[PDB]
Chains A and B, each alone.
With several copies, the nearest count.
Chain A
Amino acid sequence: TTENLYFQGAMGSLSRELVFLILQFLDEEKFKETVHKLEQESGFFFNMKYFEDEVHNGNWDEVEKYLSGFTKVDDNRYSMKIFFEIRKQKYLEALDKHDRPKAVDILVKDLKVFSTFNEELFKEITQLLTLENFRENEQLSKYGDTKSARAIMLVELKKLIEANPLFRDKLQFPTLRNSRLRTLINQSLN
């Protein structure tokens, strides 16, 4: 047998190779939540299609938990900017829904961590709370709606992820034969 577990197989640990064989099995079984929890907990593969769909839907808690399997907020400048942009968007969405109690909660719990790095910016962000419409601020005058803003932010998040040394090499799923785990275990058990 000259066959590797998969085409790029001999390059990682066996645990990493088993994770990829399992990911394909879970996908073929349609165990979708298990797929993304395994991606996140192992940190071996960042599923860009899944991240896009979760951002498109504004599932911010899930977006942050998913990212947390790959990076900490303060890891590097790209990770910092990724989290900042997501939390800034959640905050702007709260203001747009005229929910000031929720916006101050996002400001205090999610955006305050950025004040250490840039004090004046956190003050400017805070000051958006008192505007009748945040679009009054020059830098946000072009903000359309929830759909348009999530799409524009996602274009930026994708570029930041692709440039981030912690993700840049976890973005391509390896090349596996069809139902590889199922085929190998079935022959090993026989």
Chain B
Amino acid sequence: TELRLGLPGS
């Protein structure tokens, strides 16, 4: 599982 800086929903 990863958390990302990008906007939710890619």
Contacts and interface: CB of A to CB of B under 8 A. Distances in A.
A and B touch in the complex (CB under 8 A): yes
Interface of A: 77, 80-81, 84-85, 88, 114, 117-118, 121, 124-125, 137, 139-140, 142-143, 149, 152-153, 155-157, 159
A124 B5 CA distance: 8
Given A77-B1, A139-B4, A155-B9, 18 more contacts: A80-B3, A81-B3, A85-B8, A88-B5, A114-B3, A117-B3, A118-B2, A118-B3, A121-B5, A124-B5, A137-B5, A139-B5, A140-B7, A142-B7, A149-B7, A152-B9, A155-B8, A156-B9
A121 B3 contact: yes
Nearest to B1: A77
B5 A140 contact: yes
Contacts of B3: 80-81, 84, 114, 117-118, 121
Contacts of B4: 121, 139
Contacts, number: 39
Contacts of B7: 139-140, 142-143, 149, 152
For the residues of B in contact with A, the DSSP-based class is loop
Contacts of B2: 77, 117-118
16 contacts: A80-B3, A85-B8, A88-B5, A117-B2, A117-B3, A118-B3, A121-B3, A121-B5, A124-B5, A139-B7, A140-B6, A143-B7, A152-B7, A152-B8, A153-B8, A156-B9
Nearest to B5: A139
Contacts of A139: 4-7
Closest 10 CB pairs of A and B: A156-B8, A139-B6, A139-B5, A77-B1, A156-B9, A153-B8, A85-B8, A84-B3, A118-B3, A124-B5
Nearest to B8: A156
Contacts of B9: 152, 155-156, 159
